[PDB]
Design a binder for this molecule. Structure first.
Ligand code: AWD
Ligand code: NI
Length: 341
């Protein structure tokens, strides 16, 4: 059964609610982004209206084979009427196609649902600048002050400089990057660009990337592994055993692997600056864990909420324990008292 924080009151709408069968009273199902915890349940057999971005719609059609007649893509930054209710989709600064949704309820209430997001000051000059938001359904993934990490730009600078140094010292080194979902494409694209290579990958991953509206993508990716010195593999294979096995398959073209695992936050963020990060090494294989986040840091989240000044906050992540719920509620009260709303 569908939980309360996935229902939008007085609209007939649910958000990211495809794993509960037919939800009583739901006339339209919104999907914020194409990550499996959120799309869980969609297939070629779904026959209710789905509202989403153009990119999410491309993935629904081609990867999950949802029929075209049920996919309703909406442009960003544009007032749209859906089943008698005004809505707006805004970029969430998460993975490709990820949106936040603004709902203008018939009674005058205004709700913002962030989906998954990485809060940024640029959001303070979207269509949010205008009007009051009464209720905020908030991505609280990293809602605790211990969660610090660098900007995406600083992490990409580190990865580019590391890869370029290694391959210039050894032109027979292979670079490998882990993936298990869409998002974080800049990691492998930036490294391939500095090295003058296309990114090599499976047919299945190539298909997924072709759905994303990335400019000049045919120039950047390929299924021909032999032509490429940046390879993508499943995240599960980014370990000494799996990389040893991959190196065997490359027919003596390479004699070294440099690999990257883009994680979220890890406990080594409490001790180590991005500049100081070192790999794990065994023989001719080195593995770097890099803290590339597509979710708000604690400080980014706090700044956005203190700017927005919502009347009520409904968390959508870490909702399953009393300890987590009490911790989040204490932070929301601190933020409100400090800022005066
Ligand atoms: C006192 N009620 C609370 C629930 N409520 C509502 O509208 N629920 C809902 C159901 C299904 C859906 F899709 C969306 C919302 C508002 C009035
Ligand atoms: Ni996500």
């Amino acid at each position: 059964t569908c939980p309360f924080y996935k229902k939008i009151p007085g609209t007939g709408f649910t958000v990211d609610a495809f794993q509960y069968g037919v939800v009583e009273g739901c006339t339209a199902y919104f999907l914020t982004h194409f990550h499996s915890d959120h799309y869980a349940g969609l297939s070629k057999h779904f026959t209710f209206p789905v509202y989403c971005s153009e990119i999410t719609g491309n993935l629904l059609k081609n990867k999950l084979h949802v029929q075209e007649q049920y996919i309703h893509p909406l442009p960003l930054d544009t007032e749209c009427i859906v089943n008698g209710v005004k809505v707006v989709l805004l970029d969430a600064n998460h993975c490709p196609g990820a949106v936040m949704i603004l709902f203008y309820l018939p009674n005058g209430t205004v709700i913002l649902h962030t989906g998954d997001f990485r809060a940024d000051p640029s959001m303070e000059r979207s269509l949010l600048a205008d009007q009051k938001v009464h209720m905020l359904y908030l991505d609280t993934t990293y809602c605790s002050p211990e969660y610090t990490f660098p900007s995406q730009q600083e992490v990409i600078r580190f990865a580019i400089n590391t890869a370029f140094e290694a391959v210039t010292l050894n032109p027979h080194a292979l670079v490998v990057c882990g993936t298990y979902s869409i998002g974080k494409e800049k990691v492998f694209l930036a490294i391939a660009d500095v090295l003058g290579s296309k990114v090599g990958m499976s047919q299945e991953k190539y298909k997924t990337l072709q759905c994303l509206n990335i400019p000049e993508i045919n120039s950047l990716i390929t299924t021909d592994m032999c032509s490429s010195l940046v390879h993508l593999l499943p995240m599960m294979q980014i370990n000494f055993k799996g990389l040893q096995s991959h190196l065997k398959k490359c027919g003596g073209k390479y004699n070294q692997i440099l690999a990257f695992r883009p994680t979220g936050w890890t406990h080594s963020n409490k001790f180590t600056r991005i500049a100081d990060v070192i790999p794990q090494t065994k023989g001719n294989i080195s593995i770097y864990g890099i803290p590339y986040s597509e979710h708000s840091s604690y400080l980014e989240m706090k700044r956005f909420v203190q700017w927005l000044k919502p009347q009520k906050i409904i968390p959508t992540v870490n909702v399953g324990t009393w300890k987590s719920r009490s911790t989040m509620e204490k932070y929301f009260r601190e933020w409100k008292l400090e800022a005066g709303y």
